[PDB]
Coordinates of C-alpha atoms and ligand atoms in Angstrom, one line a residue:
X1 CA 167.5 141.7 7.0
X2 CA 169.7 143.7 8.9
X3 CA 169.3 145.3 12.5
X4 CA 169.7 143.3 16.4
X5 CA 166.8 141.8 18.2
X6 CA 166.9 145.0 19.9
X7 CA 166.2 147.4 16.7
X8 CA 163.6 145.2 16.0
X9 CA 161.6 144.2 19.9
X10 CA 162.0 148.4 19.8
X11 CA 160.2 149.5 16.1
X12 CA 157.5 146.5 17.2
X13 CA 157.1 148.6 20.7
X14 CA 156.6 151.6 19.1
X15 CA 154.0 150.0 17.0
X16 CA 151.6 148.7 19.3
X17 CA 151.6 151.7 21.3
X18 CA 150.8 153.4 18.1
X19 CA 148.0 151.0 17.2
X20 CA 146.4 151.7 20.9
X21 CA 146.6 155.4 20.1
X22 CA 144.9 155.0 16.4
X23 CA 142.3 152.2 17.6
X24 CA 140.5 150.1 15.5
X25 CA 141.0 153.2 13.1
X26 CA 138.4 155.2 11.5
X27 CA 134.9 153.5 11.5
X28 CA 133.1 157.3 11.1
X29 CA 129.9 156.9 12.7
X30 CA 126.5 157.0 11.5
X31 CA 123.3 157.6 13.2
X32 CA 119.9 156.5 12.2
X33 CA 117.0 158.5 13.7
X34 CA 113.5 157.0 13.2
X35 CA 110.5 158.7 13.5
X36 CA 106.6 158.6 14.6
X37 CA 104.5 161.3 16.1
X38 CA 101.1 161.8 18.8
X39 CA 98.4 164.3 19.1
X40 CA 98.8 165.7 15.9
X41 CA 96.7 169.2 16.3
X42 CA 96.7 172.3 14.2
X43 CA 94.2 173.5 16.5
X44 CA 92.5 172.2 19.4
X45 CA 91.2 169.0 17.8
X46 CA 92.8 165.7 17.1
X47 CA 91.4 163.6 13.8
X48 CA 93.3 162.1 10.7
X49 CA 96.0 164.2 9.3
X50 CA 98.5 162.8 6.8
X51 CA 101.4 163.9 8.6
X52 CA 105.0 164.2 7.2
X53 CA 108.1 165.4 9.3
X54 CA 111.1 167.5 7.9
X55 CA 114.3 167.5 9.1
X56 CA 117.1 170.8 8.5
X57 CA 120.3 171.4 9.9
X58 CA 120.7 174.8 11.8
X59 CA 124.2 176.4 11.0
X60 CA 125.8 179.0 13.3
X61 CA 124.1 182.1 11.4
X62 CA 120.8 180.6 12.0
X63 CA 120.6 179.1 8.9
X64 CA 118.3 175.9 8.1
X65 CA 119.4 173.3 5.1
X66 CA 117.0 170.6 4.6
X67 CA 118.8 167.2 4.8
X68 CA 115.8 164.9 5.1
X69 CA 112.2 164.2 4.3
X70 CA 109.9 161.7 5.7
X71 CA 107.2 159.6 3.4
X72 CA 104.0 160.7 4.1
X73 CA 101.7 158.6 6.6
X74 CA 98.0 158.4 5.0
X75 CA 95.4 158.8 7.4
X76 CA 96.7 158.5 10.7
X77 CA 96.2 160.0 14.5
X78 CA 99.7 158.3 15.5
X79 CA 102.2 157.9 12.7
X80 CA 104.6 156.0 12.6
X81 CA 107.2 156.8 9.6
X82 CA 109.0 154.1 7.9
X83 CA 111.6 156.4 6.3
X84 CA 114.5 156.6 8.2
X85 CA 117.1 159.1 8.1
X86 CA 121.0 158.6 8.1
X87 CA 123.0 161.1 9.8
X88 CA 126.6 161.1 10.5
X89 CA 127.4 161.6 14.3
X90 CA 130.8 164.3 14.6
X91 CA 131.5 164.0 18.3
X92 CA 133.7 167.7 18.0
X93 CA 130.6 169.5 16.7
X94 CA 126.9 170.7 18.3
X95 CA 124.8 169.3 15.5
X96 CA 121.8 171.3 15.8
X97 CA 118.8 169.9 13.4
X98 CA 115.4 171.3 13.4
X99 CA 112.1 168.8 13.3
X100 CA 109.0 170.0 11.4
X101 CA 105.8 168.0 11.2
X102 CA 103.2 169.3 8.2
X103 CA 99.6 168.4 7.7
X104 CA 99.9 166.8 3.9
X105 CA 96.9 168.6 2.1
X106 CA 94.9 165.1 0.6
X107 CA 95.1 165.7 -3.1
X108 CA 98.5 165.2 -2.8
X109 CA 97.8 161.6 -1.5
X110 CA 99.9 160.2 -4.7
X111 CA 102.3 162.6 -4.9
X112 CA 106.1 161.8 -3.9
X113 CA 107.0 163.3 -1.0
X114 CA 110.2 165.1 -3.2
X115 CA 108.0 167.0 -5.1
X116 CA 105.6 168.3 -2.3
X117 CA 105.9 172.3 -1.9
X118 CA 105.7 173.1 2.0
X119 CA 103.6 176.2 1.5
X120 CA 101.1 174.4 0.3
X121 CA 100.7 171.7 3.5
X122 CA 99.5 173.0 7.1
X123 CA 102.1 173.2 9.1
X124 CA 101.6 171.6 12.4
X125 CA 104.6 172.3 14.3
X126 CA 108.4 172.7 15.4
X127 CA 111.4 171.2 17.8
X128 CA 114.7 171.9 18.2
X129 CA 117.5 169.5 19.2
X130 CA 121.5 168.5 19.3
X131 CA 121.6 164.9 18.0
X132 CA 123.9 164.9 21.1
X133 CA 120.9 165.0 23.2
X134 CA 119.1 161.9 21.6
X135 CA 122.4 159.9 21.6
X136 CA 123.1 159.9 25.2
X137 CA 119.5 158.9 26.3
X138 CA 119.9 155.6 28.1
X139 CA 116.4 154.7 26.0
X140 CA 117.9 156.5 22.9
X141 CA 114.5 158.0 22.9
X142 CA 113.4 161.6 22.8
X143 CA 110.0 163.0 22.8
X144 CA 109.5 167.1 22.0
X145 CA 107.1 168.8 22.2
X146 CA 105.9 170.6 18.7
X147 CA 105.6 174.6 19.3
X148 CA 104.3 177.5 16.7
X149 CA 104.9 181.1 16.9
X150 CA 101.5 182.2 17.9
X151 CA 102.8 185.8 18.6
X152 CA 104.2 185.8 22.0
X153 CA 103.1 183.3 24.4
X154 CA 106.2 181.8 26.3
X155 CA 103.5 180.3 28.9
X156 CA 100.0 179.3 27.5
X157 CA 101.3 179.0 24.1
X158 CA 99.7 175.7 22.5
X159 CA 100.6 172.6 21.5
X160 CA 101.0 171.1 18.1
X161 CA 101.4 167.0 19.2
X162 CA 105.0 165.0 20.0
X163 CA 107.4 164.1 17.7
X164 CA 108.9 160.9 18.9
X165 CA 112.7 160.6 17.9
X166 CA 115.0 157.1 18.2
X167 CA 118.3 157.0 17.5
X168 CA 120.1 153.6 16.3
X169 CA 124.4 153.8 15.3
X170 CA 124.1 152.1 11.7
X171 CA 125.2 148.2 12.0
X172 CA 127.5 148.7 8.6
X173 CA 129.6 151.5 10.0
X174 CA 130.3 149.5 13.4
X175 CA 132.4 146.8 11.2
X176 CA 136.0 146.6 11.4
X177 CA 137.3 143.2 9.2
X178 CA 140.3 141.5 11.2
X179 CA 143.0 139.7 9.0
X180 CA 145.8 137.1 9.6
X181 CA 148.5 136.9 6.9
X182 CA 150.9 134.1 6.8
X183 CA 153.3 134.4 4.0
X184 CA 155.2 130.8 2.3
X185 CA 158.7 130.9 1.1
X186 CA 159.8 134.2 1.4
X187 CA 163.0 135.1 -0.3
X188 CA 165.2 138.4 0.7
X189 CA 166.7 140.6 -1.6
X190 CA 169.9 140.4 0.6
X191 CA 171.2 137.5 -0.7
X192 CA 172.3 134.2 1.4
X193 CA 170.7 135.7 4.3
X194 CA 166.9 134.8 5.6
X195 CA 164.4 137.7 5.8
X196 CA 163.1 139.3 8.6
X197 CA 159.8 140.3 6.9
X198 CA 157.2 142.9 7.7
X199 CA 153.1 143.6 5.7
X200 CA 152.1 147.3 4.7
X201 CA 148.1 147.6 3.9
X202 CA 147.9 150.0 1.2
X203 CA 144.9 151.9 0.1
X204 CA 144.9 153.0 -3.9
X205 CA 145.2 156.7 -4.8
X206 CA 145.2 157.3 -8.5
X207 CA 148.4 159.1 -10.5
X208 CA 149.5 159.1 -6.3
X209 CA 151.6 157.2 -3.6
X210 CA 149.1 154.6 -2.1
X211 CA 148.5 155.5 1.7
X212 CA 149.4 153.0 4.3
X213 CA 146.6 151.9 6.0
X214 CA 148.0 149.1 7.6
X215 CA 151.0 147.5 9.3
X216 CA 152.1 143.9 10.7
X217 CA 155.0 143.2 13.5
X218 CA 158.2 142.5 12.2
X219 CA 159.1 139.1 12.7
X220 CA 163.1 137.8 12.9
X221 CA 164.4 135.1 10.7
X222 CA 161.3 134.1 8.9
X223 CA 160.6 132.7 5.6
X224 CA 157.1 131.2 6.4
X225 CA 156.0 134.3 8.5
X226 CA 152.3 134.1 10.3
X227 CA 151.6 137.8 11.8
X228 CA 149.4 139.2 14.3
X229 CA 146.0 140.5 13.1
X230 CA 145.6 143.3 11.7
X231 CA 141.9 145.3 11.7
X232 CA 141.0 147.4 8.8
X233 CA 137.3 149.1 9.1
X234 CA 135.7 149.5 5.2
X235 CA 136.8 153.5 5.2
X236 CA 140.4 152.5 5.1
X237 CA 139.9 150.5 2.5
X238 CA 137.2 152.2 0.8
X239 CA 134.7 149.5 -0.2
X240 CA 135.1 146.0 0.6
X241 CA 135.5 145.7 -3.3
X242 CA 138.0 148.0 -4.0
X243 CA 141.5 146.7 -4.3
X244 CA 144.2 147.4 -1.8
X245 CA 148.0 146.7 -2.2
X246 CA 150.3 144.6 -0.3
X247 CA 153.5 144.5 0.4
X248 CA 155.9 141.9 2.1
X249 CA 159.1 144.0 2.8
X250 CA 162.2 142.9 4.8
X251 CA 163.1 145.1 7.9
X252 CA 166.5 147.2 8.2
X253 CA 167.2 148.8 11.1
X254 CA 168.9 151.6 9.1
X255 CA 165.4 152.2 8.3
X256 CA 165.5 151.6 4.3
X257 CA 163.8 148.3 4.1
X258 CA 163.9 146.3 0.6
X259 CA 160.3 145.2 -1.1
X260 CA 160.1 141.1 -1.1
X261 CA 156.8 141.1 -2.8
X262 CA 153.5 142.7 -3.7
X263 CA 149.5 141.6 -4.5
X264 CA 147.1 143.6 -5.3
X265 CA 143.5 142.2 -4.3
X266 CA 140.6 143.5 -2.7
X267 CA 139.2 142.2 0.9
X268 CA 136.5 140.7 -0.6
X269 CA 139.1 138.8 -2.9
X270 CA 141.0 138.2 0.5
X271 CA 137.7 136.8 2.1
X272 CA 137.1 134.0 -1.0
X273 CA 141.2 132.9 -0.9
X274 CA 140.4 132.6 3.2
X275 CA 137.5 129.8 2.3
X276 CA 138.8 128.6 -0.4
X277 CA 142.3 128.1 1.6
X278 CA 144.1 128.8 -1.4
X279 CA 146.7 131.4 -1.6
X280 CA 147.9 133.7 -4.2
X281 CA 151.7 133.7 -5.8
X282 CA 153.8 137.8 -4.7
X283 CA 155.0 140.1 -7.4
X284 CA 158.2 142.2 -8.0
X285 CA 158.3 145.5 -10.9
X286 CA 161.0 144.6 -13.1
X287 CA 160.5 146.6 -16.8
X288 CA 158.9 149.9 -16.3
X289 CA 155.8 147.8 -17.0
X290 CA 155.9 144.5 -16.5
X291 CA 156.4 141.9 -13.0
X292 CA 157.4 138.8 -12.0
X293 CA 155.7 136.2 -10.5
X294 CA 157.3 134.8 -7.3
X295 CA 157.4 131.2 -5.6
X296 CA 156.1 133.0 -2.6
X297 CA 152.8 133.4 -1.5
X298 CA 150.2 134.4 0.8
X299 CA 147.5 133.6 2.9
X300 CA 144.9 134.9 4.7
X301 CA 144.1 132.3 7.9
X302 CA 141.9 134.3 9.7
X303 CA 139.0 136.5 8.4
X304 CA 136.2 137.8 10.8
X305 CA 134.1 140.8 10.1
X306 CA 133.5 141.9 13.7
X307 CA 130.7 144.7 15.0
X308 CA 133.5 147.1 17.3
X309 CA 132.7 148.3 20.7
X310 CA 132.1 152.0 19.8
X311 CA 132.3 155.3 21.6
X312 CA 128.3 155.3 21.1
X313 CA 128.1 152.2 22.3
X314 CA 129.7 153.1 25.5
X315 CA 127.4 156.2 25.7
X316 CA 124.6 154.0 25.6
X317 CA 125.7 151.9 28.5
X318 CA 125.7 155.2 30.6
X319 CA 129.4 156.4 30.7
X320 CA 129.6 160.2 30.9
X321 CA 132.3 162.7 29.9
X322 CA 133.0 164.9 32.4
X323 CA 134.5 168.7 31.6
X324 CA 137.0 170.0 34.0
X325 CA 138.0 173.7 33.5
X326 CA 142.2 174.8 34.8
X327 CA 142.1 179.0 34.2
X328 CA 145.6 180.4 34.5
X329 CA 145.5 183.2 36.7
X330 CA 149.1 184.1 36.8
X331 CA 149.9 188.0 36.0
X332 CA 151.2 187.2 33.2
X333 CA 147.9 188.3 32.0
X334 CA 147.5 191.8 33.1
X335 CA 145.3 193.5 35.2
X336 CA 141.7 192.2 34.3
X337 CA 140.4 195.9 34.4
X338 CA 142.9 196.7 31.8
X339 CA 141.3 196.8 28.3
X340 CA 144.2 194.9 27.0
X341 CA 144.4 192.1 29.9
X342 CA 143.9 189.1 28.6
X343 CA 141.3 188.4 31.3
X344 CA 139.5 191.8 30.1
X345 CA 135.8 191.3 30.9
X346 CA 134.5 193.6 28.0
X347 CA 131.1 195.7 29.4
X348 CA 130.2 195.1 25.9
X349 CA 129.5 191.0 26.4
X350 CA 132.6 190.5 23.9
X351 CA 134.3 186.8 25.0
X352 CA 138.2 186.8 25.7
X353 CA 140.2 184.4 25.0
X354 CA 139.6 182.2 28.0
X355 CA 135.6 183.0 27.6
X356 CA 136.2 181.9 24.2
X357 CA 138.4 178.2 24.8
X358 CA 135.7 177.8 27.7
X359 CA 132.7 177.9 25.4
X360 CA 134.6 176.3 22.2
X361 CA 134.6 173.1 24.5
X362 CA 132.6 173.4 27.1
X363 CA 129.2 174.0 24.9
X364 CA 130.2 170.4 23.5
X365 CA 130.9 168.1 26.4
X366 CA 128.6 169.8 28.3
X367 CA 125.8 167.2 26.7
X368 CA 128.1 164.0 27.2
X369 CA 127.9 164.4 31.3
X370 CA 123.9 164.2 33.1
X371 CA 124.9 166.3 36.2
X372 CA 126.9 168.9 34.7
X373 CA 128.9 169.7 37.8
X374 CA 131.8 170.6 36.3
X375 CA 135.2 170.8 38.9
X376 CA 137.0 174.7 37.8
X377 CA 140.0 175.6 39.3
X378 CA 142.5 178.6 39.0
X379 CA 145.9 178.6 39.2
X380 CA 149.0 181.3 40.0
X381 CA 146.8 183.8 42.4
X382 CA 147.1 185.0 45.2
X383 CA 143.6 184.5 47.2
X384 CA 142.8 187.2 50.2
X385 CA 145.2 187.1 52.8
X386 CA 146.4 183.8 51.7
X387 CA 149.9 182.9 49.9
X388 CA 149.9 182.4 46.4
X389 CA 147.7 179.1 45.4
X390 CA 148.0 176.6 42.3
X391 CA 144.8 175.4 42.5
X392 CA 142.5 177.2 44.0
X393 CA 138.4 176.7 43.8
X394 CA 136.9 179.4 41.6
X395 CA 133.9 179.0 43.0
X396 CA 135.6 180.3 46.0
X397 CA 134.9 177.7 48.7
X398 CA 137.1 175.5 50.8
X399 CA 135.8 172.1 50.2
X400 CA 134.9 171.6 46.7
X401 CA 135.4 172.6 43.1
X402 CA 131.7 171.7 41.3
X403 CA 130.2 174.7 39.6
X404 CA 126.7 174.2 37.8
X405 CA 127.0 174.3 34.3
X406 CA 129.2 176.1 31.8
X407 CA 127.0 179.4 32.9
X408 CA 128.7 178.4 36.6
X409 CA 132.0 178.4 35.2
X410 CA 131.3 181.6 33.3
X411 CA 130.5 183.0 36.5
X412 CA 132.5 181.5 39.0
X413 CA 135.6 182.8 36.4
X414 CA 134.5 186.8 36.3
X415 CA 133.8 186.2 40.2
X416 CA 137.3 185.0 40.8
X417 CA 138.8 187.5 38.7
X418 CA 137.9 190.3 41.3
X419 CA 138.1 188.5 44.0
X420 CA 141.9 187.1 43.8
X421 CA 145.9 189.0 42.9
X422 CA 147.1 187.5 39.8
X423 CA 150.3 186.1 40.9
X424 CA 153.0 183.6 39.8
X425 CA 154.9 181.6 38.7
X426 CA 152.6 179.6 36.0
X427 CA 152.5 175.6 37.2
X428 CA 150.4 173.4 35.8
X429 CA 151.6 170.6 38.7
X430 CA 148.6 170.6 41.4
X431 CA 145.7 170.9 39.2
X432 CA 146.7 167.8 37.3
X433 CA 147.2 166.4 40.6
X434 CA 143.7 167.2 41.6
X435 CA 142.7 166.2 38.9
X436 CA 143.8 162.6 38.8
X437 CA 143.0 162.8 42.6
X438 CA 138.9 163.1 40.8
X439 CA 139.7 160.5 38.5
X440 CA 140.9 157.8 40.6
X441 CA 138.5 158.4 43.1
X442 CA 135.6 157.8 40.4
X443 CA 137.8 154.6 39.2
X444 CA 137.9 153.0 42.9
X445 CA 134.2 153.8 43.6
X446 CA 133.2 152.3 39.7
X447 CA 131.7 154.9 38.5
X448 CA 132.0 155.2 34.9
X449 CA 133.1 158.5 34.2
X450 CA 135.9 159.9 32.3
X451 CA 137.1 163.2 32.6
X452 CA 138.1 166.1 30.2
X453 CA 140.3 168.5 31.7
X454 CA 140.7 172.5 30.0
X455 CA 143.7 173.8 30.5
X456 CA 144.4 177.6 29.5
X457 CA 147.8 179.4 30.2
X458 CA 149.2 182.6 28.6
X459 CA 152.5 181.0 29.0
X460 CA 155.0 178.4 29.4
X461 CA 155.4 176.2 33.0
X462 CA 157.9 176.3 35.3
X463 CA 157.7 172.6 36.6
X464 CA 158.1 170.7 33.1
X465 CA 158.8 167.7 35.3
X466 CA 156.7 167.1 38.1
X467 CA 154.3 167.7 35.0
X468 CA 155.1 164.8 33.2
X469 CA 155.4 162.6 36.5
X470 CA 152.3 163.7 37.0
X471 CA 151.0 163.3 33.7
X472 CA 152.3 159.4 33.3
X473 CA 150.8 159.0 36.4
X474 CA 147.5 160.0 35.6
X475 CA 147.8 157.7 32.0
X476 CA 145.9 155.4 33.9
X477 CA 143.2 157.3 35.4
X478 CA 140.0 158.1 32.9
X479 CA 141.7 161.1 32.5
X480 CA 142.2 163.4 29.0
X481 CA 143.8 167.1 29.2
X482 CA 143.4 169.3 26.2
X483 CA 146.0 173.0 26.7
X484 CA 145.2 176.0 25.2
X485 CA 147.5 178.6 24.9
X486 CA 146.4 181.9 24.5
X487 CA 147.9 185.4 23.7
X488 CA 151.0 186.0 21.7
X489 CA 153.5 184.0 24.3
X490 CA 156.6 181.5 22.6
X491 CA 154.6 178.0 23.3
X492 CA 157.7 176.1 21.5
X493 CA 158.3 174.4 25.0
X494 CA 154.6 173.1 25.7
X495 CA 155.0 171.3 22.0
X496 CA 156.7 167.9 23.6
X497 CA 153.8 167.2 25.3
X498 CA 151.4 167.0 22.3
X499 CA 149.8 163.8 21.7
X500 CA 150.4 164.2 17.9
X501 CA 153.2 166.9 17.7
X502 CA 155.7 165.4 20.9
X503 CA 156.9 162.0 22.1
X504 CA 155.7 159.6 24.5
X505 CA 156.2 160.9 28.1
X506 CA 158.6 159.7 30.5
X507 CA 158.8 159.7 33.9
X508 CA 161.9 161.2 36.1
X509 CA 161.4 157.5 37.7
X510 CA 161.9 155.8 34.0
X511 CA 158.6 154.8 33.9
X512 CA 156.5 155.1 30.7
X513 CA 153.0 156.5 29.5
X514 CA 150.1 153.8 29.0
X515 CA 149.2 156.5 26.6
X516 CA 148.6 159.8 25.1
X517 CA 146.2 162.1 27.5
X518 CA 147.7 165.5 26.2
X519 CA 146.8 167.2 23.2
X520 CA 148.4 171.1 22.8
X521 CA 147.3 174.0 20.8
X522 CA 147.5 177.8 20.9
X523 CA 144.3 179.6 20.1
X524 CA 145.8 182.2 17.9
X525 CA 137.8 176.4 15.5
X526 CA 141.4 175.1 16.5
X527 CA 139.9 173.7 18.9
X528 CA 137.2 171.1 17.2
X529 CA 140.3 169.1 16.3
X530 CA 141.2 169.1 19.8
X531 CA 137.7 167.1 20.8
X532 CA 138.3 165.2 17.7
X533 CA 140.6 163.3 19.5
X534 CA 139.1 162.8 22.5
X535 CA 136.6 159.7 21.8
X536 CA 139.5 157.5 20.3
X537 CA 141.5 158.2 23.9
X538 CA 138.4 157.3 25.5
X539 CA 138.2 154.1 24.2
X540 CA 142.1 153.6 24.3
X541 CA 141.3 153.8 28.3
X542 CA 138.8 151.4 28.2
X543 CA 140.9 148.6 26.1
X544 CA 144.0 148.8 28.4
X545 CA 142.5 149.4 31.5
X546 CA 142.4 146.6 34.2
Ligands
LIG601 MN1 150.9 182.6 33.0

């Protein structure tokens, strides 16, 4: 191999920081609700019924898809369904899903409950829920309450029974696998010269390039290398049957490094050659079709499958996501009472942009916090009387910066919008200040919040730098910040401080990031991928921090 201890101490640096930034990668999680029921009443009396509960999914047009179907309990004043139902758990999306409990008519008592019509069952009753709302019960219990449309009867209209609702994250998709490799004898293709050998994980495509999956640290002058673990979870690999590839390659600073050897096994072959503490003879392609069988070999001397500390598990030990809102009010904009401001408040009820970026995030974290006082700030006005502020209360007071709910920070916005001078310049400085200063003082009192901060400007900042002071600073705090840009401004500039799309930050002092907090996008939803990001920072905080 060829590079300096520095090429190499720098490509294994930016490797961990990327595996803190990816996670244990890519367990997709899976929810399993479980049902039983009390009360059970089409009318006023309670007696045997053979109930049966239905589950569909509402989509945004109302919509209702059925997506599950209890068996049907015989005979029964409390039942309690064995049939569970498997739903995956998206974090970036309201999953709305729709509960209805039918009456099984009893010459159906044989029937399968597939082949049951619903029109011909009494149908006791409905409820309505986000799957985020049974997730983040401490008892990961709900009970609702089943309603009918008698007419119109907000007040005394009856009940139907409960339908009892506990939700468990599926053991199997909790499961990362963690892996040490040690290779034997490894021989470079660089001639009279030892290797300096690296692993790549590859998952098959067919009639494609295998996708990396995986990754080991380069190690220097090493012919009998043993690595660091690596974790794969069973969607990187597929199933724990499927065959992945490997490859031992030796490193080259000039960045085109030269294939030692390759296996091709699956991690349930891996998992036998770890008991057996045999290992398996590398490959090189020689004839467009056939290999050759190495002296070198490798070993797996560490195998664990290991249940990972999830985002739902941390929900379920009572940590909260708290949504901060940062509204630039900088004239930038235009006059609110200008049809074409971009702060318009339509008569109509039509969102703008910032209505829109509020809701888009807001209507989703809004579940993952208990008290909902949400901190809202503006930024670039000029309040009455006052000199222009950078972070200014929308609610309008002195002291503090809670609102009550999203419908306060609806509120609180349209207030402030009449109430303040759009001003200048647009700086983005103070409110991430304030909003470490909320962070850290949740940290020192330990509390266990972490805090999402919404960010929307119509333009491009004037203090790029005390930004990313500020920013690094804050890398330590339970702290994310999402930006939305809206309008048609040149956001080119706002790009280096994407998570994904920029670099890691660095401080004016030298100092470096402990991770990615920012994520950038311009709301020409674009936004769902912005929360898709969030849990996996969530959890990066809670590895590292100390
Ligand atoms: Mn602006």
């Amino acid at each position: 191999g060829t590079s300096s201890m520095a090429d190499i101490g720098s490509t294994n640096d930016a490797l961990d920081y990327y595996l803190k930034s990816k996670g244990f990668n890519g367990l997709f999680s899976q929810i399993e609700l479980s049902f039983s029921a009390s009360n059970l009443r089409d009318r006023d009396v309670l007696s045997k019924s053979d109930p049966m509960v239905v589950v569909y999914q509402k989509e945004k047009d109302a919509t209702l898809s059925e997506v599950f179907r209890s068996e049907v309990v015989l005979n029964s004043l409390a039942p309690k369904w064995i049939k569970k139902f498997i739903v995956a758990y998206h974090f970036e999306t309201v999953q709305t899903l729709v509960f209805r409990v039918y009456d099984v008519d009893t010459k159906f008592q044989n029937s399968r409950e597939e082949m049951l019509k619903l029109d011909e069952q009494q149908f006791l009753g409905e409820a309505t829920c986000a799957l985020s709302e049974i997730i983040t019960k401490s008892t990961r219990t709900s009970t609702l309450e089943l309603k009918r449309k008698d007419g119109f009867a907000p007040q005394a209209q009856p009940h139907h029974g409960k339908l009892i609702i506990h939700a468990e994250e599926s053991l199997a998709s909790k499961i990362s696998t963690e892996i040490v490799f040690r290779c034997s004898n490894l021989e470079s293709k660089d001639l009279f010269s030892k290797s300096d050998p690296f692993l790549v994980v590859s998952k098959i495509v067919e009639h494609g390039t295998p996708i990396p999956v995986s990754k080991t640290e380069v190690r220097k002058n090493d012919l009998n290398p043993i690595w660091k673990p690596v974790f794969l979870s069973v969607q990187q690999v597929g199933s724990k049957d499927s065959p992945v590839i490997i490859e031992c390659s030796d490193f080259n600073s000039n960045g085109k490094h030269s294939l030692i050897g390759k296996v091709q096994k699956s991690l349930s072959d891996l998992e036998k050659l770890h008991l057996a503490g045999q290992g398996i003879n590398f490959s090189l392609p020689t004839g467009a079709g056939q290999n050759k069988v190495l002296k070198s070999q490798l070993f797996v001397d560490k195998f664990t499958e290991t249940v990972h500390h999830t985002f739902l598990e941390y929900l379920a030990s009572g940590f909260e996501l708290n949504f901060m809102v940062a509204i630039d009010f900088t004239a930038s904009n235009g006059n609110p009472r200008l049809p074409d401001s971009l702060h318009y408040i339509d008569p109509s009820g039509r969102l703008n942009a910032y209505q829109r970026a509020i809701m888009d995030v807001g209507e989703v974290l809004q579940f993952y916090d208990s008290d909902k006082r949400f901190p809202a700030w503006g930024f670039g006005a000029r309040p009455i009387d006052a000199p222009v502020s950078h972070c200014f209360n929308l609610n309008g007071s002195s002291s503090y910066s809670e609102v009550d709910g999203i419908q306060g920070i609806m509120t609180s916005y349209t207030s402030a919008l009449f109430n303040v001078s759009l001003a200048g310049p647009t700086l983005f400085g103070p409110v991430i200040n304030a909003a470490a200063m909320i962070a850290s003082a949740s940290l020192a009192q330990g509390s266990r919040k972490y805090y999402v901060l919404l960010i929307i400007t119509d333009g491009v900042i004037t203090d790029l730098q005390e930004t990313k002071d500020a920013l690094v600073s804050a890398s330590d705090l339970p702290l994310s910040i999402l930006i939305v840009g809206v309008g048609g401004a040149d956001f080119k500039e706002m790009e280096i401080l994407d998570a994904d799309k920029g670099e890691r930050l660095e401080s004016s002092s030298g100092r470096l990031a402990s991770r990615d907090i920012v994520q950038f996008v311009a709301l020409r939803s674009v936004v769902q991928a912005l929360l898709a990001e969030l849990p996996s920072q969530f959890l990066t905080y809670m590895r590292i921090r100390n």
